[PDB]
């Protein structure tokens, strides 16, 4: 499923992400834009044999099990294929764990590079919420 920007912004607000750990909704919509471009099925293979899954590109080495990553931890306690559904609930619940894991939203590289320190409120413009 490819989300519309305000469509995803409402979904994320509904799942408790606005000001979650002090990160406004715009941060989360921006991170999803530059991680997956709002595509729930986005996957990126990394050279270390891990793969990043879903709208927030969560990694198979530590957070979800995809059965092909050596030395994987399955911290969110899910199959990685569950991060690839049109329902964003599994990805949002695992992201809540990752943002509280000691690096805040620095865990997402595309957010550090394209959202950190910017006017992230632009990402919610025109959204009815």
Curated annotation (Swiss-Prot):
Species this chain originates from: Gallus gallus (Chicken)
Record-linked InterPro entries: Glyco_hydro_22 (IPR001916), Glyco_hydro_22_CS (IPR019799), Glyco_hydro_22_lys (IPR000974), Lysozyme-like_dom_sf (IPR023346)
Location of the protein in the cell: Secreted
Protein family according to the UniProt entry: Belongs to the glycosyl hydrolase 22 family.
Reaction(s) catalysed (UniProt annotation): Hydrolysis of (1->4)-beta-linkages between N-acetylmuramic acid and N-acetyl-D-glucosamine residues in a peptidoglycan and between N-acetyl-D-glucosamine residues in chitodextrins
Keywords associated with the record: Allergen, Antimicrobial, Bacteriolytic enzyme, Disulfide bond, Glycosidase, Hydrolase, Secreted, Signal
Role summary: Lysozymes have primarily a bacteriolytic function; those in tissues and body fluids are associated with the monocyte-macrophage system and enhance the activity of immunoagents. Has bacteriolytic activity against M.luteus.
Subunit structure: Monomer.
This protein's name: Lysozyme C
C-type lysozyme domain residues: 1-129
EC top class, as a word: hydrolase
Disulphide bond pairs: 6-127, 30-115, 64-80, 76-94
Keyword Transmembrane: no
A cellular component annotation (GO) from this entry: extracellular space
Tissue-specificity statement: In the egg white and polymorphonuclear leukocytes.
Active site residues per record: 35, 52
SUPFAM superfamilies in the cross-refs: Lysozyme-like
Misc note: Lysozyme C is capable of both hydrolysis and transglycosylation; it also shows a slight esterase activity. It acts rapidly on both peptide-substituted and unsubstituted peptidoglycan, and slowly on chitin oligosaccharides.
């Amino acid at each position: 499923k490819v989300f519309g920007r305000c469509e995803l912004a409402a979904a994320m607000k509904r799942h408790g992400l606005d000001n979650y750990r002090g990160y406004s909704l715009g941060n989360w919509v921006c991170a999803a834009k530059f991680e997956s471009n709002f595509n729930t099925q986005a996957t990126n293979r990394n050279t270390d044999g891990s793969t990043d899954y879903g709208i927030l590109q969560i990694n198979s080495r530590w957070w979800c099990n995809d059965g092909r990553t050596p030395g994987s931890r399955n911290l969110c306690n899910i199959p990685c294929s569950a991060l690839l559904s049109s329902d964003i609930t599994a990805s949002v619940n695992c992201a809540k764990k990752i943002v509280s894991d000691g690096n805040g939203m620095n865990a997402w590289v595309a957010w550090r590079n394209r959202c950190k320190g910017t006017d992230v409120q632009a990402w919610i413009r025109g959204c009815r919420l």
